[PDB]
Amino acid sequence: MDEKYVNSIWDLLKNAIQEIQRKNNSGLSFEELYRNAYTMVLHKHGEKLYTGLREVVTEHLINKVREDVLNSLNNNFLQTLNQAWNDHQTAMVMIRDILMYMDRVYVQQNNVENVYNLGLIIFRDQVVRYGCIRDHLRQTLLDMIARERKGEVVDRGAIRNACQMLMILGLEGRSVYEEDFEAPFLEMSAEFFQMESQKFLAENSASVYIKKVEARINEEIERVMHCLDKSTEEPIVKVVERELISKHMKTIVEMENSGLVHMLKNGKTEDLGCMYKLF
Amino acid sequence: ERQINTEYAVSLLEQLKLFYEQQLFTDIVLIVEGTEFPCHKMVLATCSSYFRAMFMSGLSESKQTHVHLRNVDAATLQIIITYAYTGNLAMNDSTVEQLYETACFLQVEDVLQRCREYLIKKINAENCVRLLSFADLFSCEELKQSAKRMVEHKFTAVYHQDAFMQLSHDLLIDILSSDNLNVEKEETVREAAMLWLEYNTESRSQYLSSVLSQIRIDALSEVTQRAWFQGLPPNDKSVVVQGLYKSMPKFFKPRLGMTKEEMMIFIEASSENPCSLYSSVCYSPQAEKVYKLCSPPADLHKVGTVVTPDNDIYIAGGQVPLKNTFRTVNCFYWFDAQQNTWFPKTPMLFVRIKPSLVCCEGYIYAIGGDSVGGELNRRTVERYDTEKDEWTMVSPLPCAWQWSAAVVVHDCIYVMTLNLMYCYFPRSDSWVEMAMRQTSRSFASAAAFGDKIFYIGGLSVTVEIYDVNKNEWKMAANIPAKRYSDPCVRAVVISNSLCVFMRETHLNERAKYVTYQYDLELDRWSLRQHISERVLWDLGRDFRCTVGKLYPSCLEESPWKP
């Protein structure tokens, strides 16, 4: 029909979506919006609808969550981030339902990502990969994981929630999450384990150091399998071995004071067994 | 997966149907222009992808039991609901459009796919542009493409459809700018584009530029340019300027429909690879080349051919080996002139062996061919409807004949046997007795050239010419063939001139292919062209011949060493 009719339809649909984004879907009518999406995509105006959806979503994000995260960067930063992620997801549920009715025809014809993937991408671009939020999140996660490694206990379910959030934000696999979280955490763990091995090689001998490094590996793999994502272990354990064992192998078995020769001369069976099972 | 359906799923669905028809355990009712449809939310959630969001999203409509759904038909929603309680769609041929519209509105994927298949199978002759605009309205790649090609093929022969006038620009641009126009001339598309903007001259002068440019320089002649000029709305200056631009640029190239070379389609040839038995190839009279075709079933043989006046190829009947660790099938197929494939059609009702298909008055007539026989009568015939896509029983043959031939002359059916001939009147659906031949010959075929039937061969070189206006059989001459041989004669029309395609075979000698030019008043087969063995190899004995136009670019040459 005329442009005024479709403009009014799009205006009312945008108003209804804005309400859904403000958690006011209880007073919205599923029929009215589905029929309007039907009569909108029917007239071959899906491009305008998609562009308007993207614009409304990114505007709502930049106005609400970009301000909320930057306003509470020190008072429950990760908690507010997880809450905003959950709100975005629970709104994009219905948003994706309607615009998935739209997505069938649109993405099967125009060959583009779905609206759920569109929301995930725009969220990744406007919140997580922000110029300031990204570095702040990196620094705070490194600080809290270092404080956890120091010996004192902190919250652990929140880290699992954040890692699952980043994994879902990847939206294709382990491309972004393995880079935004692991890459930095890897350098920090490298420096930490290097300093730890350098401190252990001088303060102890080849007798009690092996049990300590075994306990360290056990607690590290347990934290990585319980507090982090599902695979999470190949590069972590590779770098941990390359830092600890590849450095202690040359000096701890030959120097002096009950290394490998002395612990074999006196006849220590458990020492040889644990050294064989570790190396 | 661990899940059954033997007397447990069917029982569950029957209990759900009983609860529905008795109006039991219903918690949601659909209001459709005053009509009430009490139903359940579980079935609507498992069937439609829209009702799941209608009942899941915490909203006012989810809570409302009296939901007022509009922009939907009552009968269509009722049939969708009953398909959601029985699985039986039972769709007709008239309400398919509104049913598909309501299915796309409600996002019911299974019935959507069902209606899509039903529509893609039923693009016969007329609803082509209509369902094409339908698939343009509701983006449907499958329908869109089949309908696109269907229009490229038939639209370029009528170019006078009422639904064609009511088309969106982008669709018209895609249709006209494509290189799949089955037109032997370039002015027909020009005048078609003209009348598309003649019913909307002045009003639609914006498209009168893009569509004009689409026809290209081949038909953007100074004459039509100046015509459109003197015809436009007054006080239009820049329009003439932009029209003058369209004459030299934009890649004038030849089209594809002009390559309608009258060629020679063949079936059941001597296959090259010993893993295959037979093959279907073609011969070019002018290009002097041998093209190949894809086998329609790829395992079934003993088929019959027919060519409509619109240059269409069909295949009916045939036998296929049972492949246990030759069974007869009544399947039907049609050859695509561009995709080099075979799309099946409505199969026959009787499994025929080598059926003789004849085209007349737009209908396909399959005369005899072992429809299946085991009685004193048996003589039967089944005709096909190219428009309604169905088989219609007609008056059966008067006498039972084997290894017979049938042609069409002057919009009438003529079947030839050993010595008798009957003319089937399509208007009255009856057989009238015709002249009898003085010679008893079988295993031969006849050709319908002009107003005379030329029954050639039989067991030989018997040339018995029959005329319809005269109703008499006469002899003309004997074809010049080498002695001590068994010629395989093939009579067919070519270039509006009666010719023959014969092959001679001797003892300890190779086969030779050569076509001769026969004259009516001379009674002699002048040497027209001798098919060289360097391009064509042996064919066999059970091969058939028919005349038809094909495309060289779509088909592929048959590789064979000279």
Curated annotation (Swiss-Prot), chain A:
Q: Where in the cell is it found?
A: Nucleus; Golgi apparatus; Cell projection, Cilium, Flagellum; Cytoplasm, Cytoskeleton, Spindle
Spans traversing the lipid bilayer: none
Q: In which tissues is it expressed?
A: Brain, spermatozoa, and testis (at protein level). Widely expressed.
Q: How is it modified after translation?
A: Neddylated. Attachment of NEDD8 is required for the E3 ubiquitin-protein ligase activity of the BCR complex. Deneddylated via its interaction with the COP9 signalosome (CSN) complex.
Disease the record associates with this protein:
Pseudohypoaldosteronism 2E: An autosomal dominant disorder characterized by severe hypertension, hyperkalemia, hyperchloremia, hyperchloremic metabolic acidosis, and correction of physiologic abnormalities by thiazide diuretics. Neurodevelopmental disorder with or without autism or seizures: An autosomal dominant disorder manifesting in infancy and characterized by global developmental delay, variably impaired intellectual development, and speech delay. Some patients have seizures, others have autistic features or behavioral abnormalities. Additional variable features include cardiac defects, failure to thrive, or brain imaging anomalies.
Record note on quaternary structure: Forms neddylation-dependent homodimers. Component of multiple BCR (BTB-CUL3-RBX1) E3 ubiquitin-protein ligase complexes formed of CUL3, RBX1 and a variable BTB domain-containing protein acting as both, adapter to cullin and substrate recognition subunit. The BCR complex may be active as a heterodimeric complex, in which NEDD8, covalently attached to one CUL3 molecule, binds to the C-terminus of a second CUL3 molecule. Interacts with RBX1, RNF7, CYCE and TIP120A/CAND1. Part of the BCR(SPOP) containing SPOP, and of BCR containing homodimeric SPOPL or the heterodimer formed by SPOP and SPOPL.
Function of the protein? Core component of multiple cullin-RING-based BCR (BTB-CUL3-RBX1) E3 ubiquitin-protein ligase complexes which mediate the ubiquitination and subsequent proteasomal degradation of target proteins. BCR complexes and ARIH1 collaborate in tandem to mediate ubiquitination of target proteins. As a scaffold protein may contribute to catalysis through positioning of the substrate and the ubiquitin-conjugating enzyme.
Q: What name goes with this protein?
A: Cullin-3
Q: What is the lineage of its organism?
A: Eukaryota, Metazoa, Chordata, Craniata, Vertebrata
Swiss-Prot record, chain B:
Q: Name one GO cellular component term.
A: Cul3-RING ubiquitin ligase complex
Specify one Pfam family: Kelch_1
Q: Which SUPFAM superfamilies match?
A: Kelch motif (SSF117281), POZ domain (SSF54695)
On subunit structure and binding partners, the annotation says: Component of the BCR(KBTBD2) E3 ubiquitin ligase complex, at least composed of CUL3, KBTBD2 and RBX1. Interacts (via the BTB domain) with CUL3.
- Recorded domain comment: Recognizes the BCR (BTB-CUL3-RBX1) E3 ubiquitin ligase complex substrate, PIK3R1, through the 4 tandem C-terminal Kelch domains.
Q: Which InterPro entries match?
A: BACK, BTB-kelch_protein, BTB/POZ_dom, BTB_POZ_KBTBD2, KBTBD2_BACK, Kelch-typ_b-propeller, Kelch_1, SKP1/BTB/POZ_sf
Is this entry keyworded Oxidoreductase?
Answer: no
- Record protein name field: Kelch repeat and BTB domain-containing protein 2
Q: Where is the BTB domain?
A: 26-93
